[PDB]
Amino acid sequence: IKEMPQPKTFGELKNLPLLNTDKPVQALMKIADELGEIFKFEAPGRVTRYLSSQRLIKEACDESRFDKNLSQALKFVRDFAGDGLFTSWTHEKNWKKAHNILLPSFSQQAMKGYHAMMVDIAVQLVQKWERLNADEHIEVPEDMTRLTLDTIGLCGFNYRFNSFYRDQPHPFITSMVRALDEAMNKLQRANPDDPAYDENKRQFQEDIKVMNDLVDKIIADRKASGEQSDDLLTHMLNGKDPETGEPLDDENIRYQIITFLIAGHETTSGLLSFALYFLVKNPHVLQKAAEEAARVLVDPVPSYKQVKQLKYVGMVLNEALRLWPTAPAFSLYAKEDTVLGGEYPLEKGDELMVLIPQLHRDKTIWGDDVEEFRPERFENPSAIPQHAFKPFGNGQRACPGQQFALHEATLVLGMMLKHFDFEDHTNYELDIKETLTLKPEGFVVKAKSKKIPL
């Protein structure tokens, strides 16, 4: 029975000032690198434990022993995302009800239905880039966010955000990004009700009104047409949970729309951003992915079947998620008193944080080359131990949009590599921006068209 390490303390504030930063996950990664596979983190009237090893995370992922906890982060997001699927407790009635109602939105028949809509946004991306003038660059995260928001708007809610008709971000994006920012900046706050934050509170309320105003328009736009387009919104409004036999109420649908708009695009945006960063910094890997794109995508328009054939683009995406899982943490609580790792006594209700990027750098699982971008690690998926790769969370609270996100990413990266040569013309220094989620900031490239018609 061993005692956990703890990082430096600041008296009465304990460990809290260590999150006094705009890059908390990255600061916690540096702490995990010092203290190893587990550490205690204390704030006034709080303790959590940060897990970094596959040895401890495969236990934490035992659904008989631990359930999804809401971090302070998710508890702050809940102020706008409510009891939607991401910010609900497993024991709230609306969790299982929604989960039951909304999973058929992710059947293979639904995916084949979304494909054509994904191609619609992807073509708008290729055309934007084909239409640039000589020596104009691409703002990569800004453009990936144009695609991913448009794609979830169209696929989920048959709503066009028309992001590629704006040179500024969609107002929804500006309000979402600053909501997630305030959620993150609250974490570090010793004195949250200090009137020096009275502004932040009013800006947070304003940002929630924007997000709800757009929800009103999505719902009005559908109750007008009355479609039943076999999409996410159809099930939200018309699906009965087979357990309770009940449909979702109006208040829960609103939270589900907020939830699917944010979770349905932001992290896929980061994935494509990171995937393109690694490709330009690793030209052998870029060329192998570009060769696959050119050989497989023989038609002006990618087919569902042809996206399924892009194994190497898939491996690029998994490898990008290994190094920078874009939802970089999930929280758990002990269902009962139990012993973690035959070493760490935990009391019932005790919080765990899974530090996904440290997990993904566990040298006892991945070998001593953990920092290198080597998609070939994923050629043979069986060789990856249970619970080593967790970018999509765990068990029944795992990502329901996992196949959607990677189908989108694979389609769009395939089309990107097919149609352009990329140049890291600034020699970009990775700068990872944290809004709870992760994304490269200031990442720009030049794309020389290969002139392949569309």
Ligand code: MNH
């Ligand atoms: C890459 C893209 C991408 C990543 C890295 C991703 C990562 C995650 C992680 C991690 C969790 C678990 C969080 C936790 O607290 O345990 C999760 C839960 C979720 N995510 Mn997905 N997320 C998507 C794409 C992803 N999600 C897409 C696409 C959608 C929707 C179409 C989506 C909607 C969800 C929802 C809803 C949940 C909540 C599931 C539940 O608890 O029932 N998402």
Ligand SMILES: CCCCCCCCCCCCCCCC(=O)N[C@@H](Cc1ccccc1)C(=O)O
């Ligand atoms: C529908 C809405 C989708 C939003 C998705 C955003 C969530 C995805 C990742 C969240 C991971 C953030 C990690 C935050 C840093 C952290 O570990 N915070 C922890 C630790 C903490 C301890 C004491 C005081 C404050 C905080 C936390 O929030 O509890």
